[PDB]
Each structure stands twice: as structure tokens, then as C-alpha cells.
Amino acid sequence: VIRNLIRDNRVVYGGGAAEISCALAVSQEADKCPTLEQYAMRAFADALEVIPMALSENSGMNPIQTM
Amino acid sequence: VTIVVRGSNKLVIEEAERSIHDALCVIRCLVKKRALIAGGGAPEIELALRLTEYSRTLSGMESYCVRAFADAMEVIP
């Protein structure tokens, strides 16, 4: 942690905030992919949400409603 | 009103009345809803495309339930 903090001061907010923000960008940019990879780009967004969806499940909360 | 029809064979007159029904049916659709739309499954794609954008604004379980409604329309085209 401290090694990466010193090597790069830039950091992002954990708790699944980054995975949810990345999923929204990938979902919007997937529309700009005129080829069969469009279905794969959408799948990358839903797959990114499993990390935050897993933290909600392990905490004893509804994963999808919290997602 | 009433329509008189003539034709050589039974099939020649049969398809004439079958076609008049579809003509009357499609015309009936325009009377109730004076509008037209494209075919080829294009309504299902615009429906599936904008519903996915509509689900992003929704909250709760309706997001995945509406996204699944959008993906289901893609079976037609």
C-alpha cells in the first residue's frame, strides 16, 4: 500500500465505488463498438459489479438492491 | 357494406377473402392508432436500446428487471 502510494500519489475510493463507476463508462462506450465485441463490453460491466455485489452479500444485505 | 367476389377455383377466392381480412385488420390498426413504424425488428432495437438507458436512472430491483426486459426484445430481430 505505502509502496504504491509513494510510487503514485493518485488513489481511488474503494468499497466498490471504482468498479461501479468503471461499469457505467464501459456500458456507455460499448454502444460505440460496432462489432461482435459489443456483447463482450457489456459483459465486462456486469462482471465488474460482482466485487461490490459480493461485499453486499458478505455483509448480510440484499446485493442487487444495494448494487 | 358487403363485398361480392368471383374466381375460378375455391383457392383463388379463398385467398381473396383471407387477404381482405388482413387488409381490414391492418387498416383497423391505423384507425385506432393513426401512425406507422418500421419493420425488420427495428422497434425492438430502439425499445431495447433506450430501455437500457432508462434502467440506469431507475433504482432498486427494477434496474435488472427492466434491463432483462430490454434484452428480451433482441430475440425478434
For residues B7 and B13, is the Cβ–Cβ distance under 8 A?
yes
d(CA A59, CA A49): 16
B2 class by beta-carbon count within 10 Å (0-12 exposed, 13-18 middle, 19+ buried): exposed
- How far is residue B27 from each of residues A44, B7, B34, measured CA to CA in Å? 46, 24, 9
Residues 6+ apart with CB under 8 A from A63: A53, A54, A56, A57
Structure's resolution in angstroms: 3.1
Tell me if residue B77 falls in helix, strand or coil: coil
Name the grid cell of B18. 383471407
Which technique was used to obtain these atomic coordinates? cryo-EM
A13 class by beta-carbon count within 10 Å (0-12 exposed, 13-18 middle, 19+ buried): exposed
For residues B77 and B41, is the Cβ–Cβ distance under 8 A?
yes
Name the grid cell of B22. 388482413
Residues 6+ apart with CB under 8 A from A67: A20, A49, A52, A53, A56
First to last CA, chain A: 27
Cα B32 vs. chain centroid, distance in angstroms? 14
- Which of A24, A27, A65 faces B61 most closely, judged by CB atoms? A65
Tell me if residue B55 falls in helix, strand or coil: helix
Cα B77 vs. chain centroid, distance in angstroms? 12
Radius of gyration over every alpha carbon of chain B, rounded to an integer in angstroms? 20
Residue B64 with chain A: CB contacts under 8 Å: 64
Q: Which helix (H) or strand (E) holds A44?
A: helix A37-48
Name the grid cell of B75. 430475440
Q: Determine the angle formed by the axes of helices A37-48 and A50-58, rounding to 10 degrees.
A: 30
Residue A24 with chain B: CB contacts under 8 Å: 56
- How far is residue B31 from each of residues A26, B19, B28, measured CA to CA in Å? 44, 18, 5
- DSSP one-letter code for B9: S
CA atoms within 13 A on the CB side of B22: 6
Chain A: closest CA distance from residue B49 (Å): 9
